[PDB]
Amino acid sequence: SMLRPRLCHLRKGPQGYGFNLHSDKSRPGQYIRSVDPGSPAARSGLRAQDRLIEVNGQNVEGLRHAEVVASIKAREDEARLLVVGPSTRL
Numbered sequence: 001s002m003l004r005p006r007l008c009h010l011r012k013g014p015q016g017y018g019f020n021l022h023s024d025k026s027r028p029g030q031y032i033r034s035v036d037p038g039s040p041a042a043r044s045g046l047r048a049q050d051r052l053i054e055v056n057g058q059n060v061e062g063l064r065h066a067e068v069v070a071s072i073k074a075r076e077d078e079a080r081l082l083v084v085g086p087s088t089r090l
Contacts (some may be wrong), residue, residue: 005053005082006082006084008041008044008046008082008083009079010041010044010046010078010081011040011043011044011078012040012076012079013040017040017041017072017079018038018039018042019032019041020032021065023065028061029061030048030051030052030060030063031052032048032083043090044081046079049085050084050085051086051087052081053072053075054066054081054082055072055079055081056071056074056079058071
């Protein structure tokens with residue numbers, strides 16, 4: 001239904017997943033800065049400007065960048081990323 005976070009199931013490829021994970025200088029959280037065309041990331045439903053909520057079922061909102069990276073890299077084959085699209089308080 002509307003405005004639900006989306007589970008993106010990425011199947012790792014030979015060059016990884018094909019996205020860039022970024023911290024923001026103004027908002028807490030980790031975000032998808034870009035998604036390589038035709039990558040495992042793209043096929044999973046991930047999009048630039050998505051915000052990461054969970055990795056493999058575990059909430060990552062309290063973690064430092066390096067720890068979130070480690071969590072994504074934990075399984076050889078895959079990563080399950082729960083994400084939401086951009087939002088702004090007005």
